[PDB]
Coordinates of C-alpha atoms in Angstrom, one line a residue:
Chain A
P1 CA 92.2 133.1 44.3
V2 CA 94.5 133.2 47.4
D3 CA 95.7 136.2 49.3
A4 CA 99.2 137.4 48.4
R5 CA 101.3 136.9 51.2
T6 CA 105.0 137.4 51.2
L7 CA 107.3 134.7 53.1
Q8 CA 109.6 137.3 54.3
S9 CA 107.7 137.7 57.7
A10 CA 107.7 133.9 58.2
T11 CA 111.2 133.4 57.1
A12 CA 112.4 136.2 59.7
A13 CA 110.7 134.7 62.4
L14 CA 112.1 131.6 61.8
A15 CA 115.5 132.8 61.6
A16 CA 115.3 134.9 64.8
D17 CA 114.1 132.0 66.9
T18 CA 116.7 129.4 65.6
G19 CA 119.5 131.6 65.2
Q20 CA 120.6 131.8 61.3
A21 CA 124.3 132.7 60.5
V22 CA 125.6 133.3 57.1
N23 CA 128.7 132.0 58.4
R24 CA 127.7 128.6 60.0
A25 CA 125.9 125.4 58.2
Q26 CA 122.7 124.9 60.3
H27 CA 119.8 122.5 60.1
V28 CA 117.5 125.4 59.7
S29 CA 119.1 126.3 56.2
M30 CA 118.1 123.0 55.0
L31 CA 114.7 124.1 55.7
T32 CA 114.8 127.3 54.3
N33 CA 116.4 127.0 51.0
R34 CA 114.0 124.1 50.0
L35 CA 110.9 126.2 50.4
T36 CA 109.0 126.9 47.2
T37 CA 105.4 127.8 46.5
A38 CA 105.6 126.7 42.9
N39 CA 103.4 123.8 43.2
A40 CA 101.2 125.6 45.8
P41 CA 97.8 125.5 43.6
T42 CA 98.2 121.8 43.1
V43 CA 98.6 120.6 46.9
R44 CA 95.7 123.0 47.9
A45 CA 93.4 121.1 45.4
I46 CA 95.1 117.8 46.8
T47 CA 93.9 119.1 50.1
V48 CA 90.3 119.7 49.1
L49 CA 90.0 116.1 47.7
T50 CA 91.2 114.3 50.9
Chain B
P1 CA 130.0 100.6 36.2
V2 CA 128.9 102.4 39.4
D3 CA 125.9 104.7 40.0
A4 CA 126.9 108.5 39.6
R5 CA 125.9 110.0 43.1
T6 CA 127.2 113.5 44.1
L7 CA 128.9 114.2 47.3
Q8 CA 127.0 117.5 47.9
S9 CA 124.3 115.5 49.9
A10 CA 126.7 113.6 52.0
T11 CA 128.9 116.9 53.0
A12 CA 126.0 119.1 53.6
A13 CA 124.7 116.6 56.3
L14 CA 127.9 116.2 57.9
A15 CA 128.5 120.2 57.9
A16 CA 124.9 120.4 59.6
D17 CA 125.7 118.1 62.2
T18 CA 128.9 119.0 63.2
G19 CA 128.7 122.8 62.8
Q20 CA 130.9 123.9 60.2
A21 CA 132.0 127.6 59.9
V22 CA 134.0 129.5 57.0
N23 CA 135.4 131.7 59.6
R24 CA 136.7 128.9 62.1
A25 CA 139.1 126.4 62.0
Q26 CA 137.5 122.6 62.6
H27 CA 138.4 119.4 62.7
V28 CA 135.7 118.4 60.4
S29 CA 137.5 120.7 57.8
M30 CA 140.4 118.6 57.6
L31 CA 137.9 115.3 57.0
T32 CA 136.3 117.2 54.3
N33 CA 139.2 118.8 52.2
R34 CA 140.9 115.4 52.2
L35 CA 138.0 113.7 50.4
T36 CA 138.6 112.5 46.6
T37 CA 137.0 109.9 44.6
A38 CA 140.0 109.8 42.2
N39 CA 141.1 106.1 43.4
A40 CA 137.7 104.8 44.0
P41 CA 137.9 102.3 41.0
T42 CA 141.1 100.9 42.7
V43 CA 140.2 100.6 46.5
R44 CA 136.9 99.1 45.1
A45 CA 138.7 96.4 43.3
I46 CA 140.9 95.8 46.7
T47 CA 137.8 95.1 48.4
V48 CA 136.5 92.4 46.1
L49 CA 140.1 90.9 46.7
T50 CA 140.0 90.7 50.2

């Protein structure tokens, strides 16, 4: 089991630090749209194995 | 035959490097809207001929 913490707080801080605009294309967006927690349980088991 | 690679990855990188805005008019757009792969087989045959 893991604590259920939303990504909105983390994403909002990142958008503020590196100004994110809906109108413009930025490197920060390429990082943000690629975020996914689907495979999180698998990676955290790899972390223990290492 | 040629490998089928989409232009989205190439265009997205170009838009990020040179900031592309829907609101503003930029030199990068004039390059992007003019992209076309319709005559690609003809040009690649010219390349071999040279």
